[PDB]
């Protein structure tokens, strides 16, 4: 029925912090298990990332901040661990060739979010990502 | 508000003023009344302000 | 001196609006960015302006408007 799960998660991480995301978080496991053995990391990554911008479900939570945003990462890191695709997700560089290579790590330094920085390092992110682009 | 921040990306912000009654596109705006008015000894400090300064710099620049 | 810079700038402004009054065309010369949204769900109006700012007193910038571009996207 073409459920708006990519649209719903973007409006969730801005302001609808905890409870609306987790009700959507249970919905995605129901939508992946139906194929009973597909290419699993190909499908779940495409349902978290726009085609053109390449923006993840983490970075959209990282651009706008909110005094609940420590919670919005740990819930989102634990979901990427239950499908064992956290490593390709945490190093998901921007690929729209505007400011390409700017990863989810790079937003955390520039926004001066020191607390979720060490959380983002503890998952094992690459601290060496080159960012070419329009700048 | 009459001012917005488009994007930050570090210490380089981009300004954006509202400009709805300020430039000469309507009748009797602030720019027309700040130039064609006597009886004010404080005009030459007024045009230093940011929605007036760079705009009047821009309108002289392009034509 | 150190005050003629301001009062001559007025004498520039005496001419600039005079050329505005001299040309009652449709004004193809645009001098603003039209219909750019400030913030609403419906009101996308009040044509705008762009300048640049500078350094220290950093803070966590909450209210942005776009996904950090410098120029237009695409």
UniProtKB/Swiss-Prot annotation, chain B:
It is found in: Cell membrane; Cytoplasm; Lysosome. ANK repeats lie at residues 25-47. Expressed in keratinocytes and hair follicles. Belongs to the transient receptor (TC 1.A.4) family. TrpV subfamily. TRPV3 sub-subfamily. Non-selective calcium permeant cation channel. It is activated by innocuous (warm) temperatures and shows an increased response at noxious temperatures greater than 39 degrees Celsius. Activation exhibits an outward rectification. The channel pore can dilate to provide permeability to larger cations. May associate with TRPV1 and may modulate its activity. Is a negative regulator of hair growth and cycling: TRPV3-coupled signaling suppresses keratinocyte proliferation in hair follicles and induces apoptosis and premature hair follicle regression (catagen). Homotetramer. May convert from a homotetramer to a homopentamer to allow pore dilation. Interacts with TRPV1; may form a heteromeric channel with TRPV1. Interacts with SNX11; this interaction promotes TRPV3 trafficking from the cell membrane to lysosome for degradation. This is Transient receptor potential cation channel subfamily V member 3. The gene is Trpv3.
């Amino acid at each position: 029925k073409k459920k708006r799960l990519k649209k719903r998660i973007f409006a969730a991480v801005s302001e609808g912090c905890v409870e609306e995301l987790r009700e959507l978080l249970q919905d995605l496991q129901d939508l992946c298990r139906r194929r009973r053995g597909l290419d699993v990391p190909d499908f779940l990554m495409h349902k978290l990332t726009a085609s053109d911008t390449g923006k993840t479900c983490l970075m959209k939570a990282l651009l706008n901040i909110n005094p609940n945003t420590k919670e919005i990462v740990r819930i989102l890191l634990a979901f990427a661990e239950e499908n064992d695709i956290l490593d390709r997700f945490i190093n998901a560089e921007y690929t729209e060739e505007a400011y390409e290579g700017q990863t989810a790590l790079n937003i955390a330094i520039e926004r001066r979010q020191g607390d979720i920085t060490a959380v983002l390092i503890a998952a094992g992110a690459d601290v060496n990502a080159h960012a070419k682009g329009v700048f | 508000s009459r001012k917005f921040t488009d994007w930050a990306y570090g210490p380089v912000s981009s300004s954006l003023y509202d400009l709805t009654n300020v430039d000469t596109t309507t009748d009797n705006s602030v720019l027309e009344i700040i130039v064609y008015n006597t009886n004010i000894d404080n005009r030459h400090e007024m045009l230093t302000l940011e929605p007036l300064h760079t705009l009047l710099h821009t309108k002289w620049k392009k034509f | 001196s150190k005050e003629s810079e301001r009062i001559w700038r007025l004498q520039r402004a005496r001419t600039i609006l005079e050329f505005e009054k001299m040309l009652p065309e449709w004004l193809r010369s645009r001098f603003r960015m039209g219909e750019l949204c400030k913030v609403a769900d419906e009101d996308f109006r009040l044509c705008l302006r762009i300048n640049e700012v500078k350094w220290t007193e950093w803070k966590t910038h909450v209210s942005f408007l776009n996904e950090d571009p410098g120029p237009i996207r695409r």
